[PDB]
Ligand binder design. Sequence first.
Ligand SMILES: [Fe+3]
Ligand SMILES: [Mg+2]
Ligand SMILES: [Mg+2]
Ligand SMILES: [Mg+2]
Ligand SMILES: [Mg+2]
Ligand SMILES: [Mg+2]
Lengths: 211, 196
Amino acid sequence: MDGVHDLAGVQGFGKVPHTVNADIGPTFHAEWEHLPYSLMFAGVAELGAFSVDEVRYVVERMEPRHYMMTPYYERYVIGVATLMVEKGILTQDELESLAGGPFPLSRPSESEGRPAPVETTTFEVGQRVRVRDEYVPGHIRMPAYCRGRVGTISHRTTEKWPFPDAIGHGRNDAGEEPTYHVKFAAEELFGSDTDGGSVVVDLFEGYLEPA
Amino acid sequence: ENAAPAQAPVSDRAWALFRALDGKGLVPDGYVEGWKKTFEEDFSPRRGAELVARAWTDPEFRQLLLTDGTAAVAQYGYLGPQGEYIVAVEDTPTLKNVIVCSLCSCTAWPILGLPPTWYKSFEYRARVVREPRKVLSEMGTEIASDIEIRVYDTTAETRYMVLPQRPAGTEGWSQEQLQEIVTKDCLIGVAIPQVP
Ligand SMILES: [Fe+3]
Ligand SMILES: [Mg+2]
Ligand SMILES: [Mg+2]
Ligand SMILES: [Mg+2]
Ligand SMILES: [Mg+2]
Ligand SMILES: [Mg+2]
């Protein structure tokens, strides 16, 4: 999904709000902040109601202006609540009643997702690959800066996982694929407009093709 | 035009979500409290520091950590949620590694701790992939001109830690002494370990 969450390479932001080794304060800065992650795990591990991939996607589905003005932990409160409503576990009415006011949620999905690709290639360390020039409206773990770009395999994972574009929509056809650490030269991604050396993206097999 | 939607206070919304689920018997007794304890007390960059100090003093472990990070971390019992498949990335005299999750906040939780606010910031997520040298400089870390910066974007299930270079002046230090100078920021890759 080409949403505002796909921030890598966006220009116009100021300084990162940190200097190295500065005190970051406690893990949680407010008494509610442990709830989004804990309740995500309740949903994933205890209820089996959704996957972590579905949590990523529901956060991507926040209305764009809403996403841009919402603090990190709050986005996950909104996302987990949205999933609970979408899965029929909770109602928005009861959330708003208990909250004592408005509890707007992420927007409905505009894609049913896609299955794990039937045809993929097992790649080896050192091989040149291109990221498939594909546009996916639902969940995908390919940041746009690498779409259509060429890099070299530095690692093939020894484990396999469900394809995000499927499991992020709760589909039954996510299968399993390994991922690949693909190293791109900075100039392959940003031309002359970068001060870096290389960028390594961890890409599912189904996002790749031989170069 | 472009205005925020009306919203109840975030604390009220977060506790409403808890109460709605808890009131339906969907949250086991002590569940969120247990996770809070895990997040605050168990998941810690002190664990990553211990791994780095071991790698620095034990060539055999260093090799294991860099070839099978998962197995190396498992020896210490530090695998966990958001840290089940680990890759350690080695800094060298010509290479500096830095980690980000541009799409959200993906972090090797059990060994680095939960990500800090700055790591999850739009500024870091947008900028470090494209201008890591400037970002690190602004943060207080000057990377010498003869060093390639490599940014790892945590886009799938691999969870990363940086193995920084061991600084001069630490020769013969104990593992405890070495652990002390490997900070959270060193493990993320934005800082270089400092000797007093
Ligand atoms: Fe993330
Ligand atoms: Mg975009
Ligand atoms: Mg606000
Ligand atoms: Mg699992
Ligand atoms: Mg030495
Ligand atoms: Mg001594």
